[PDB]
């Protein structure tokens, strides 16, 4: 069976470089091109270039010209892709694929480009059936847990999956739908916990004062 095996996942700081390998088996490596493609999380496939495994001749996508290198070592049926001066938006799964038709793909190599380190969140009230909530900003890494009224309020609670920002930090929001009649009498407190930074925040959410 045709297979392309790629090197392991890496995390690099902005400005660094990454070199991904792609080793072929199950066919004669020099009989087909090797194409390189990447895919940012939740985004589409983006072509990077092609290498001819016989000569080593290359074609680089305009977007990467100047900082992408493709080479091959035919003695071990391996193609390499090195991407330099990494940016946060180079975070992606990098794939190699066989031939002009990309008829077999490697399993992919995840490369994350980040300088993020452990950081606790800043919590803000989202003032208000009525919808009220808590904005949990700029924490790293996951997870954050959110409870309402120390666990007393569970019905109508929706804690959204986090957004992983271009800064490398996460943010999330937790919202609760409550009867609008209770706003003036019921106290609403979200309890945010970020175990990696040992941060716990209790934030009271007051109704948006009339006048």
């Amino acid at each position: 069976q045709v297979q392309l095996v790629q090197s392991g996942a890496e995390v690099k700081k902005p400005g660094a470089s990454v070199k991904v390998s792609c080793k072929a088996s199950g066919y004669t490596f020099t009989s087909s091109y090797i194409n390189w493609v990447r895919q940012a999380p939740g985004q589409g496939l983006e072509w990077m270039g092609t290498i001819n495994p016989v000569s080593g001749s290359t074609s680089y996508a305009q977007k990467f010209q100047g900082r992408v290198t493709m080479t091959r070592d035919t003695s071990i049926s391996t193609a390499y892709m090195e991407l330099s001066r990494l940016r946060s938006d180079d975070t992606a799964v990098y794939y190699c694929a066989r031939g002009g038709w990309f008829d077999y793909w490697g399993q992919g190599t995840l490369v994350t480009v980040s300088s993020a380190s452990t950081k606790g969140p800043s919590v803000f009230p989202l003032a208000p059936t009525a919808a009220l909530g808590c904005l949990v900003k700029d924490y790293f890494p996951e997870p954050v847990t959110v409870s309402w009224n120390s666990g007393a309020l569970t019905s109508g609670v929706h804690t959204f999956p986090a957004v992983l920002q271009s800064s490398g930090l996460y943010s999330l929001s937790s919202v609760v739908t409550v009867p609008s009649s209770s706003l003036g009498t019921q106290t609403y407190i979200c309890n945010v916990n970020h175990k990696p930074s040992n941060t716990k925040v209790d934030k009271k959410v007051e109704p948006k004062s009339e006048f």
Binding site: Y33, N35, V37, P41, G42, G44, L45, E46, W47, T50, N52, S59, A61, Y95, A97, G99, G100, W101, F102, D103, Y104, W105, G106, Q107, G108, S122, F124, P125, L126, A127, A131, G133, L135, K137, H158, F160, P161, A162, V163, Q165, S166, S171, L172, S173, V175
Partner: protein
């Protein structure tokens, strides 16, 4: 040159669906080299059709490809649940041919009634603004299929800078949730008459708006 695909397509089990891939007369209109790839979550793409209409050995005859003018099309007949995946069109890449992929199309095989999103837009809090920061929060939930387009406006003008949007993720009820955040300075928030979150689902766009003042 770019290849344009619909962002999302859907159909019920047993039905037939078509995914389009539009290029120009110089690419799709000139060569029989358009290919289609299927990609399941967390998996590498798989070649389904190559050379516009050819199937690799082992690919179900339920998948077929065609082309008319500058548009190549993938057709899937007898939809099965396993067909739910993202699909990309692309061109042959090698020699004198430079590669290009279409933006992808999410295919949903309908397992429940289609459901419009519930959208809530929150302005920056008094606390955040006091801290010299400002974030607009657009929360999108209970939608099906799990595909949305989120855009932001400053008054009536589009704004792209400072936008962070999640990809939809499945909720416990098999409907989807997504969220979008617009970061501004407190001055940008107070200098505009309004900011809007626009959510498009299945060709239906709802726009939520918040203003820094009551008058």
């Amino acid at each position: 040159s770019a290849l344009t695909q619909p962002a999302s397509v859907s159909g019920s089990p047993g039905q037939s669906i078509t995914i389009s891939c539009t290029g120009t007369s110089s690419d799709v209109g000139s060569y029989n080299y358009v290919n289609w790839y299927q990609q399941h979550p967390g998996k590498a793409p798989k070649l389904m059709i190559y050379g516009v209409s050819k199937r690799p050995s082992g690919v179900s005859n339920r998948f077929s490809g065609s082309k008319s003018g500058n548009t190549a099309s993938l057709t899937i007949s007898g939809l099965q649940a396993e067909d739910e995946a993202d699909y990309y069109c692309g061109t042959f890449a090698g020699g004198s041919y430079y590669g290009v992929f279409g933006g992808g199309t999410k295919l949903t095989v309908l397992g429940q009634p289609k459901a419009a999103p519930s959208v809530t837009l929150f302005p920056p809090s008094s606390e955040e603004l006091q801290a010299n920061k400002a974030t607009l929060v657009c929360l999108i939930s209970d939608f099906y299929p799990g595909a949305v387009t989120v855009a932001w406006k400053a008054d009536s003008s589009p704004v792209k800078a400072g936008v962070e949007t999640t990809t939809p993720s499945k909720q416990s009820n098999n409907k989807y949730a997504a969220s979008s955040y617009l970061s501004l300075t407190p001055e940008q928030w107070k200098s505009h008459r309004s900011y809007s979150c626009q959510v498009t689902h299945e060709g239906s766009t709802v726009e939520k708006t918040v203003a820094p003042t009551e008058a």
